[PDB]
Amino acid sequence: DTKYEIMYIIRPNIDEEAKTALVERFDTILKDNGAEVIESKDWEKRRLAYEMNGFREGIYHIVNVTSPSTAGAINEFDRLAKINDDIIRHMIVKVE
Amino acid sequence: VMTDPIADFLTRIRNANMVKHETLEVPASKIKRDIAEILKREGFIRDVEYIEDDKQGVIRVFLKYGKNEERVITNLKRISKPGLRAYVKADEVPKVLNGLGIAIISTSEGVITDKEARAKNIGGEVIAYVW
Amino acid sequence: YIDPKHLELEDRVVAINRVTKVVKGGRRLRFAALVVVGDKNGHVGFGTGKAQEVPEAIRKAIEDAKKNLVEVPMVGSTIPHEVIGVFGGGRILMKPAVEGSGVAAGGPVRAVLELAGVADITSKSLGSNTPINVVRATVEGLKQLKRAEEVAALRGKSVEEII
Amino acid sequence: VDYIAANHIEYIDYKDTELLKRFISERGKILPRRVTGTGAKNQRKLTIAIKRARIMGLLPFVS
Amino acid sequence: SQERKNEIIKEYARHEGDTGSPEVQIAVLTEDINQLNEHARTHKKDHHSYRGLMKKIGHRRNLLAYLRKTDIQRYRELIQRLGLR
RNA sequence: GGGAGACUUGAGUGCAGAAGAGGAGAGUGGAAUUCCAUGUGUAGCGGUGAAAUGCGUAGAUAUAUGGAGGAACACCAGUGGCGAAGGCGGCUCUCUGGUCUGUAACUGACGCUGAGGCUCGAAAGCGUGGGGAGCAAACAGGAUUAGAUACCCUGGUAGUCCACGCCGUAAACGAUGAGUGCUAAGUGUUGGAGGGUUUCCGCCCUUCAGUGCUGCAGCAAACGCAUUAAGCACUCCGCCUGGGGA
Ligand SMILES: CN[C@@H]1[C@H](O)[C@H](NC)[C@H]2O[C@@]3(O)C(=O)C[C@@H](C)O[C@H]3O[C@@H]2[C@H]1O
Ligand SMILES: [K+]
Ligand SMILES: [K+]
Ligand SMILES: [K+]
Ligand SMILES: [K+]
Ligand SMILES: [Mg+2]
Numbered sequence: 001d002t003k004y005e006i007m008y009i010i011r012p013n014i015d016e017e018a019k020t021a022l023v024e025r026f027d028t029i030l031k032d033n034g035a036e037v038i039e040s041k042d043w044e045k046r047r048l049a050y051e052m053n054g055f056r057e058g059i060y061h062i063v064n065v066t067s068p069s070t071a072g073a074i075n076e077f078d079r080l081a082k083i084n085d086d087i088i089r090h091m092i093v094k095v096e
Numbered sequence: 097v098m099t100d101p102i103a104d105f106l107t108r109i110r111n112a113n114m115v116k117h118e119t120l121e122v123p124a125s126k127i128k129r130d131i132a133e134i135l136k137r138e139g140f141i142r143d144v145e146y147i148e149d150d151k152q153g154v155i156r157v158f159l160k161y162g163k164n165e166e167r168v169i170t171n172l173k174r175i176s177k178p179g180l181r182a183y184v185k186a187d188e189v190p191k192v193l194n195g196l197g198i199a200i201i202s203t204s205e206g207v208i209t210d211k212e213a214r215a216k217n218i219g220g221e222v223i224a225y226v227w
Numbered sequence: 228y229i230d231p232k233h234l235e236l237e238d239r240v241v242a243i244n245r246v247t248k249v250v251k252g253g254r255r256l257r258f259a260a261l262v263v264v265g266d267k268n269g270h271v272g273f274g275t276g277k278a279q280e281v282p283e284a285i286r287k288a289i290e291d292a293k294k295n296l297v298e299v300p301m302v303g304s305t306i307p308h309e310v311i312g313v314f315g316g317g318r319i320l321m322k323p324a325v326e327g328s329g330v331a332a333g334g335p336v337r338a339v340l341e342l343a344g345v346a347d348i349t350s351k352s353l354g355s356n357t358p359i360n361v362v363r364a365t366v367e368g369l370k371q372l373k374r375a376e377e378v379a380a381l382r383g384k385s386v387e388e389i390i
Numbered sequence: 391v392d393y394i395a396a397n398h399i400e401y402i403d404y405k406d407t408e409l410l411k412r413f414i415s416e417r418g419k420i421l422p423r424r425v426t427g428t429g430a431k432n433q434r435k436l437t438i439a440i441k442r443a444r445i446m447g448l449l450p451f452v453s
Numbered sequence: 454s455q456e457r458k459n460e461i462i463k464e465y466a467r468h469e470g471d472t473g474s475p476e477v478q479i480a481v482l483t484e485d486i487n488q489l490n491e492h493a494r495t496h497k498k499d500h501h502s503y504r505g506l507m508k509k510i511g512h513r514r515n516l517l518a519y520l521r522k523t524d525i526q527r528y529r530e531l532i533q534r535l536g537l538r
Numbered sequence: 539g540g541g542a543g544a545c546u547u548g549a550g551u552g553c554a555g556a557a558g559a560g561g562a563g564a565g566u567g568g569a570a571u572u573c574c575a576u577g578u579g580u581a582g583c584g585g586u587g588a589a590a591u592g593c594g595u596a597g598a599u600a601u602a603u604g605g606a607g608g609a610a611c612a613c614c615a616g617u618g619g620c621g622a623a624g625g626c627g628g629c630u631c632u633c634u635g636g637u638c639u640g641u642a643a644c645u646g647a648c649g650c651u652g653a654g655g656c657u658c659g660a661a662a663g664c665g666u667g668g669g670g671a672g673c674a675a676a677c678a679g680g681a682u683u684a685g686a687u688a689c690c691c692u693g694g695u696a697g698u699c700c701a702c703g704c705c706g707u708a709a710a711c712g713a714u715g716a717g718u719g720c721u722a723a724g725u726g727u728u729g730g731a732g733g734g735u736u737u738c739c740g741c742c743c744u745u746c747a748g749u750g751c752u753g754c755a756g757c758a759a760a761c762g763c764a765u766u767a768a769g770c771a772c773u774c775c776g777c778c779u780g781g782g783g784a
């Protein structure tokens with residue numbers, strides 16, 4: 001299995017309740033698609049270097065995950081992540 | 097790939113001779129040892145020593161130079177080739193530079209010089225001219 | 228280095244070439260002379276000279292040639308063995324010939340061989356026939372001729388063992 | 391001296407804005423390694439890390 | 454995959470520890486060639502990878518020719534197991 | 539050369555590592571151009587050697603805020619990298635080829651070349667279906683000019699982009715076929731390996747494979763080439779035999 005690091009920027013105005021449901025939702029997407037979420041933790045709430053979907057602040061949340069290259073967990077995360085209004089942006093990278 | 101180890105041996109001697117190297121090494125073979133011996137006793141090289149190794153052995157040749165480091169060997173030419181084998185009959189045995197050089201000939205009596213071959217009145221495959 | 232003195236050298240004009248340098252005012256025509264010099268006893272040389280007149284050009288050519296003498300090995304009336312002289316375009320094959328067969332050579336090669344004292348020799352010019360380069364090619368071949376005694380000494384053999 | 395090699399860091403996380411900041415100039419452009427001293431291998435890794443940082447808003451594209 | 458490769462090596466090894474031999478190499482090249490063909494049919498514009506497939510095929514052909522010229526009994530045994538022609 | 543054996547150096551496999559704009563697919567980022575909308579604002583703007591066409595009081599250009607869409611990826615960036623060549627430059631993931639370095643467990647010459655065949659092959663072009671910002675054959679207008687079916691200017695269609703299928707040609711060039719071995723040195727640089735120092739960092743040396751520059755021997759008509767040969771050799775292929783007519 002390959003190791004991926006997922007970092008996505010949550011809109012800075014999200015409620016604490018909505019964030020918790022949001023974070024839970026995107027762990028369940030990966031768990032459901034054959035991926036082991038080795039960790040997932042809010043990193044920081046930071047000013048953005050430029051406007052991103054109208055926002056200049058964001059809450060960066062990092063997920064560390066493992067899964068086979070064949071599994072659809074990463075693709076499924078990317079699909080639902082783009083549609084989501086709360087998630088401004090995300091990047092999925094392989095890590096060692 | 098290497099298709100003519102004899103021609104490789106002659107060229108290694110030619111190239112080392114050109115820059116007047118003291119010694120030269122080559123992968124060993126029976127025919128290469130035969131040629132080295134003839135160069136030894138005909139006065140073209142100073143010595144030849146053999147090294148037993150794990151692959152096929154190594155033959156070390158000691159090149160010969162006269163007073164003022166004049167080259168004893170002027171050049172060496174491969175005559176018979178994989179692409180065109182050359183055979184001479186006893187009466188066709190060549191003389192190289194009117195006898196000042198030698199031709200190394202492979203015969204059923206062994207690998208010998210042109211002088212020896214026409215003494216025994218036999219031909220064979222012409223390996224190389226040396227002068 | 229073969230010392231010109233003590234030798235009775237003879238001269239042979241091989242070629243006289245009229246050459247032109249182009250100048251603002253027209254053309255500066257000169258003569259370039261190629262001369263072979265030799266003692267007809269085994270020493271031969273060649274030289275070139277340029278001058279506004281033929282006699283002056285030949286003199287310079289002769290003086291140059293004497294400074295560049297070489298000795299040719301010689302067995303009787305012919306050369307010890309076959310040799311191929313190559314210089315630039317020139318390519319000269321020279322072979323020993325039987326006694327009395329004469330100098331079967333053409334062009335400038337004849338001058339070199341006759342002034343060197345070779346009387347019987349077969350040769351063929353295989354390359355360009357520009358006189359300067361064939362003469363140069365010839366001497367390159369003659370400088371490759373070897374004496375049996377020198378070959379035997381270098382190989383640590385008697386002349387009989389070699390032959 | 392190659393700053394990356396000196397610090398003995400073999401992984402260059404693009405979240406490390408502190409590290410990445412010394413390898414961009416004023417106006418935020420990537421600096422040549424001939425100006426910064428970093429080696430060829432580390433320069434390539436830095437370039438990816440910086441470019442990934444820009445896309446994630448940790449570094450600016452311009453200004 | 455190194456796991457799939459090793460298990461093919463053990464299935465076809467001429468003896469204990471035999472990694473290099475016409476049977477082992479040909480068999481491993483056979484699953485490599487089959488997998489790369491599946492990739493090829495999905496990625497029909499991947500001409501650069503296809504060249505790797507062709508070199509694999511020629512190497513397999515060369516090793517099969519060597520096996521046939523060397524031991525025709527082994528050659529027939531192998532091609533049956535791998536289903537070659 | 540044939541036959542029966544043996545061998546491990548060539549070649550390949552295993553194991554352990556290294557780098558990469560190698561390829562394919564699907565997404566995605568910012569800068570900029572253009573268009574569009576809305577404020578601000580007022581007579582120019584644009585362009586040339588000089589001009590004019592053109593655009594603008596039906597409100598331009600500029601400037602601000604947004605929206606749409608296409609194409610290309612600043613810096614990094616480098617006789618740097620990768621690829622058989624053509625070629626490949628934002629980022630992310632999926633699939634995938636090759637190469638390089640150690641090791642020396644395995645095979646035991648299994649190799650090289652390769653007519654004919656097959657595959658790939660810049661750009662332009664062609665077919666079907668999409669797209670179309672910028673650029674721009676054709677073309678229009680304005681100039682220049684003796685004339686201008688040009689160079690210059692203002693526009694501008696195909697095309698340039700995508701999918702699929704054709705085409706199969708280029709100063710497709712290193713104008714240098716492929717394989718192998720051998721033959722002074724110096725100095726850069728890319729990826730490795732090993733050791734000697736260095737608290738590390740790094741420096742020192744040895745080495746492999748690339749990539750450059752300089753330069754002997756040798757070669758060359760000369761120019762020049764020179765361990766990345768055009769040197770010294772062997773193998774196989776392609777090709778040449780005065781110019782024109784072709
Ligand atoms: C301007 N005076 C010129 C000048 O001196 C020229 N040399 C540079 C000179 O050159 C000459 O002497 C020449 O050599 C040729 C002749 C055509 O003109 C001659 O006269 C030329 C003189 O007329
Ligand atoms: K989103
Ligand atoms: K790879
Ligand atoms: K088209
Ligand atoms: K180097
Ligand atoms: Mg002179």
Ligand SMILES: [Mg+2]
Nearest residue numbers: 661662663698
């Ligand atoms: Mg095209």
Ligand SMILES: [Mg+2]
Nearest residue numbers: 706707708710
């Ligand atoms: Mg052509």
Ligand SMILES: [Mg+2]
Nearest residue numbers: 748749765766
């Ligand atoms: Mg090198």
